[PDB]
Amino acid sequence: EDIDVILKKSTILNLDINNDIISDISGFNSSVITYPDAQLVPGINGKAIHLVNNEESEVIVHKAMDIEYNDMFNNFTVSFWLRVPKVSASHLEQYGTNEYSIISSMKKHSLSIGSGWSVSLKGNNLIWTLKDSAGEVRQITFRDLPDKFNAYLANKWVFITITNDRLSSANLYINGVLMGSAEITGLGAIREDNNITLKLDRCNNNNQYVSIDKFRIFCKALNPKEIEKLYTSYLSITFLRDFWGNPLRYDTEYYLIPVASSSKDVQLKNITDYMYLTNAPSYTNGKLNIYYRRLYNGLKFIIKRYTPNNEIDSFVKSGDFIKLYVSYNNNEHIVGYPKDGNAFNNLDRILRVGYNAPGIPLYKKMEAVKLRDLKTYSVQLKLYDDKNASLGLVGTHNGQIGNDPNRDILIASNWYFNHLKDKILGCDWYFVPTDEGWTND
Numbered sequence: 001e002d003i004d005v006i007l008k009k010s011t012i013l014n015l016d017i018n019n020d021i022i023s024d025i026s027g028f029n030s031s032v033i034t035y036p037d038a039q040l041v042p043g044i045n046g047k048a049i050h051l052v053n054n055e056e057s058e059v060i061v062h063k064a065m066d067i068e069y070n071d072m073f074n075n076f077t078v079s080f081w082l083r084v085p086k087v088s089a090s091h092l093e094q095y096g097t098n099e100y101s102i103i104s105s106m107k108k109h110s111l112s113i114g115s116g117w118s119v120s121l122k123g124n125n126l127i128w129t130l131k132d133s134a135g136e137v138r139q140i141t142f143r144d145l146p147d148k149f150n151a152y153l154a155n156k157w158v159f160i161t162i163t164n165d166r167l168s169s170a171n172l173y174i175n176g177v178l179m180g181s182a183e184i185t186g187l188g189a190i191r192e193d194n195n196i197t198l199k200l201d202r203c204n205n206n207n208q209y210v211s212i213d214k215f216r217i218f219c220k221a222l223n224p225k226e227i228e229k230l231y232t233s234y235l236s237i238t239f240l241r242d243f244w245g246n247p248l249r250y251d252t253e254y255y256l257i258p259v260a261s262s263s264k265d266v267q268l269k270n271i272t273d274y275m276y277l278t279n280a281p282s283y284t285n286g287k288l289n290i291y292y293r294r295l296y297n298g299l300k301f302i303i304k305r306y307t308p309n310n311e312i313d314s315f316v317k318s319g320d321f322i323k324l325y326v327s328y329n330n331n332e333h334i335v336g337y338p339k340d341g342n343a344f345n346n347l348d349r350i351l352r353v354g355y356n357a358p359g360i361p362l363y364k365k366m367e368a369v370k371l372r373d374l375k376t377y378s379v380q381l382k383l384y385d386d387k388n389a390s391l392g393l394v395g396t397h398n399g400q401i402g403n404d405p406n407r408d409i410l411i412a413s414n415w416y417f418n419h420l421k422d423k424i425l426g427c428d429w430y431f432v433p434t435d436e437g438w439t440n441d
């Protein structure tokens, strides 16, 4: 069959946000109740749900009769995009042994004691737990990667999927890749609450928050192929993304980091001069087992709309023509390539910032595109001259200018169009904005 048909046909619950309202679009009409303090924020493909730590911040799903008892004995899969802020080193020391649910089908203020399932967080652990009638429990404890730049519970949108085969195991997938599992034989009936609660439950950190989107339940244990297509079905390729996975926007500051050399920052030699790579400083914590390259150092860039022509959108679409500026000291300096400007061997054109030589054409029309690496939150940039001929993709070239030190210098080159299939490529960029979910320790 199709992966599309069985994904759709096994869907039993599907939360979608339309017209700023949250409802189940599965076909089963489970009623959804949004409390006053459940917030809506930018998501993966539309808006997403945002929960803070108070009793008014919650979204409840009252299961339709027809799907009431679907996970009592049968196989099921839960899927959703998740965004959790990077945990501070102090919060790992304070609340690191504090386990709190964020999504659950279990009861608590009656006397039941939670037969059912739950998605919970505990420091830098993602935990799936299933509990049956007898109080027997099975758990998957996923321990996140220690390098926070590449971790899954460190402020980027990530796609979670947990399948449960009652005859074998429960499997936890992150961005389509199997990352944890537990044998679930020995469990009896799951006799859970009639409501599925999205809420922070028993979290001691008053400032904790999480974002969730596309919460979906399937009536089967999905296989790896189905999971992969499902994951990729949300990655709409028209709207560019920032480093966190949210929509890239015009008129906002972004730090640039080259995807192929993620430990480097971008730096300016000078006004009217060139840009080059530098090593980012990093944070390490042996005791808590966490480390990362620090963010927010090095140049800030702004993307401006190159023309209006009708509808003005605040999001940048692939193919949009733009003007790129370096945002320095409250001033903004255009990035471009002067007519016969310095280049490496008549072909890697050296980019210049705020160049203004009298009488010399300065080419600065760029096109923001998504030409490769779909799952990665990165962007490519193409420069044009005034005959609308391609001057190349923005990348870096190793070399020296005058008597300066050898450096990886920012350039525009048509040479990258011959290598778009490579696994790793020098013309891919991450656009990083400052965010409350990531503060350096």
Ligand SMILES: OC[C@H]1O[C@@H](O)[C@H](O)[C@@H](O)[C@H]1O
Pocket (backbone or CB within 6 Å): 304, 305, 306, 307, 308, 309, 311, 312, 313, 314, 319, 320, 321, 322
């Ligand atoms: O804002 C909407 C966008 O429309 C595109 O046509 C244009 O190339 C962009 O620069 C921007 O204006």
